[PDB]
């Protein structure tokens, strides 16, 4: 058809123009400019606390906003709240579905979000007059496994599922106020901006997309990976982010430049990255692999500076405190470790 | 502890009580059998569940002779299988259902590829997975009565051009069973259980119970070191 041919040629011309515009703004590289700075020495971290009590593989965790409490989820059917300072358990929530794959902590400390592989996102209220934790709202409407959920405030939450669609919900009512579509493969992870105005998502089609909470449509798309994307995280500044994939390669993308800056990979690593996180100052990039240990990279020189060995199975979750005092890693051996 | 105040020892006692409750609840979840269910969609898994009946994940819990079975059906998911299959690594057994009347039938989307070839490819993919290298597979063959009714009107040579036999019920059943069992590549770590479905629930329940008991006793003998 003439219309189909003209649409295809218009799309090809637009893609070529976008590629040419991206190439035009490429004058130098991050490594060459940064090479003049003094590299940081070897980083030594030792475990302090060991959190035990789970009886199955741990799939998600999230640090509290006070840098003292955390929450962990595992397939045994329990959601456990840990006090890191004294290694005490505050609450243990029995789940209706044991196939949990994500969890999230409210920024105010009153609610906890749970979900995964059940098309239902549950909200649990911690501050109750009756003295027990009870579910307050069940959100439904997805047609695929739930992969990630993040709080915005006490009445807003953003979720991503396996149906190639992200949703912004309203807890009080229970209806999707905004839907984001455009991904081909399944959506695996999302990251919220510090100002809670934009967020980014990574999909199984080796792509990442920058969305808009207030507007509701995609803004920019980033490519470069050769396999599935499993993790994503914003820079502390908020003008760049990092992606981890299954081809033993991490990448750093810039929102303002809309291009690639640095690539972190080694010839001795052939496994897949499972978690990606940053530091308080944005200098250390922590990557949790499935080779039973985590790695620490220099975000400005792409040189490895430490390995956090100590886990006997896959490392699936990793988190860094708001004040940057410690880092918590979880694994499939039902053990959590705190490093500093 | 001596440094702990009066408001810190009560927290320790509460944590110990939580630990005791978790330990008590964890020993009851290991006394139940977990069975994954797979198939070809319309291969007849629904009627198999119906014979032994008491969105993405369907759970069926039922007891028989003081033994509890929990069965996970994942038919209504429609997602990427490789991104969540490792969640079912610790299942006791995987049930795979095959219809005997699909050899003449073809796929609705395309008539080039038979339903039998698709079922065989699915069985080969599931059996040789890296996560299920030591998990038992129970193969059910259903819709045998209609297959027997229609066997005379169409030779099996349409589905298998290289077949040369008496074109009777026993020979065709043995040939199909052998072709399904020949797809195994380990032959030392896992075995395939084959049964022909009947109209009586008791036979199917007894076969499932015997299979799971044999799997459990073999596994525990292997862990004991004698086997």
């Amino acid at each position, epitope marked *: 058809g003439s219309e189909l041919d003209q649409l295809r040629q218009e799309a090809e011309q637009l893609k070529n123009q976008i590629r040419d515009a991206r190439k035009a703004c490429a004058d130098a590289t991050l490594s060459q400019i940064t090479n003049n700075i003094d590299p940081v020495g070897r980083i030594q971290m030792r475990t302090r606390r060991t959190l035990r009590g789970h009886l199955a593989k741990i799939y998600a965790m999230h640090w509290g906003t006070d840098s*003292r*409490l955390l929450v962990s989820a595992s397939q045994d059917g329990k959601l456990i709240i840990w*006090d890191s300072y004294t290694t*005490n358990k*505050v609450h243990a929530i029995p789940l209706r579905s044991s196939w949990v794959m994500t969890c999230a902590y409210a920024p105010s400390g009153n609610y906890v979000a749970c979900g995964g592989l059940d098309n239902i996102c549950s909200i649990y209220n911690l501050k109750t*007059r*009756e*003295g*027990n934790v009870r579910v307050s709202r069940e959100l439904a409407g997805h047609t695929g496994y739930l992969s990630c959920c993040r709080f915005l405030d006490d009445n807003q939450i953003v979720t991503s599922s396996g149906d190639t669609t992200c949703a912004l919900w309203d807890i009080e009512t229970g209806q999707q106020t905004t839907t984001f579509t455009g991904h081909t493969g399944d959506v695996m992870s999302l990251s919220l901006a510090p100002d809670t105005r934009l967020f980014v998502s990574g999909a199984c089609d080796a792509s990442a997309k920058l969305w808009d909470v207030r507007e509701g449509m995609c803004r920019q798309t980033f490519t470069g990976h050769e396999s599935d994307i499993n993790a994503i995280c914003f820079f502390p500044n908020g003008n760049a982010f990092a992606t981890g994939s299954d081809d033993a390669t991490c990448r750093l993308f810039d929102l303002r430049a809309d291009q690639e800056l640095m690539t972190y990979s080694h010839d001795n690593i052939i496994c897949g990255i499972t978690s990606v996180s940053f530091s308080k100052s944005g200098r250390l990039l922590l990557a949790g692999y499935d080779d039973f240990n985590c790695n620490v990279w220099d975000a400005l020189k792409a040189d490895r500076a430490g390995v956090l060995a100590g886990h006997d199975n896959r490392v699936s979750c990793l988190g860094v405190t708001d004040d940057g005092m410690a880092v918590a890693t979880g694994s499939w051996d039902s053990f959590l470790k705190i490093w500093n | 502890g001596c*440094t702990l*105040s*009066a*408001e810190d*020892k*009560a*927290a320790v*006692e*509460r944590s110990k*009580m939580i630990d005791r409750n978790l330990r008590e609840d964890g020993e009851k979840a290991a006394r139940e059998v977990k069975l994954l269910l797979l198939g070809a969609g319309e291969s007849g898994k629904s009627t198999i569940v119906k014979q032994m009946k008491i969105t993405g994940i369907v759970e069926t819990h039922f007891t028989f002779k003081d033994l509890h079975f929990k069965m996970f059906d994942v038919g209504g998911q429609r997602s990427e299988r490789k991104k969540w299959i490792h969640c079912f690594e610790g299942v006791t057994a995987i049930i795979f259902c095959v219809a005997l009347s699909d050899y003449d039938l073809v796929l609705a989307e395309d008539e080039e590829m038979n339903r039998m070839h698709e079922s065989m490819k699915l069985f080969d993919s599931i059996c040789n997975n890296k996560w299920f290298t030591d998990t038992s597979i129970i193969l059910f063959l259903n819709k045998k009565d209609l297959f027997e009714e229609k066997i005379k009107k169409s030779p099996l040579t349409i589905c298998y051009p290289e077949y040369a036999g008496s074109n009777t019920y026993e020979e065709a059943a043995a040939y199909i069973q052998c072709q399904f069992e020949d797809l195994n590549k380990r032959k030392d770590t896992k075995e395939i259980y084959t049964h022909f479905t009947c109209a009586t629930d008791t036979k199917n329940v007894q076969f499932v119970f015997d299979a799971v008991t044999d799997v459990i006793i073999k596994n525990n003998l292997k862990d004991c070191g004698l086997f």
Partner: single-chain antibody
Amino acid sequence: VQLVESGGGLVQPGGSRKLSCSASGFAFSSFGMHWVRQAPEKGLEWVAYISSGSGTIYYADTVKGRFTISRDDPKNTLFLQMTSLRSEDTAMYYCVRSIYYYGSSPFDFWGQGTTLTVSSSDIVMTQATSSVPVTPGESVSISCRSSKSLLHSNGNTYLYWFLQRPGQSPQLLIYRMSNLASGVPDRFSGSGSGTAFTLTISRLEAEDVGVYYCMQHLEYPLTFGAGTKLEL
């Protein structure tokens, strides 16, 4: 949520009695229980404490070896058995719930109270004043002092402020000397350091008339302060 206690009445000096209270509206099996005594025209007095699961039981030196405390979670009931009753056991008895974990606020609900009449080291906590006549529209400051420092190595300061309206059960106002309770106006404030503590109230109305008590929870036994009265 409500606690209802009973078992009162007048008895001869030689006799044994049982006080029974029932809880309804919350998980009775997750809250530790305290018994509090109040002599007529006097202040409060701690009696006994039982933990969740009957793990730790604490008694008062005055009634040690003479009072028994029992808990029934099947029936959601608390029992207090008294064997020998002297002439100083005539008072009002309350039942208090308290849950201990990181960020919790003990001493939430104080029950209703029952009357018991009979015919015929520790930390000293002191109240500065005893009666301050005031008028609505002005701030009121109340001072409390402790013999020993209530500050711990972790930084906590176990101080609790209470208020008993005329004919009403006491209620919690401030816990740990800095944290405001739930359901009270933001006007009430508390502060202090070391052995000195201050409670300030602003924009008083006619309904804020009662007695304020300062209590320490650093170590057992729990000692209540004196009583400061306010007038309209």
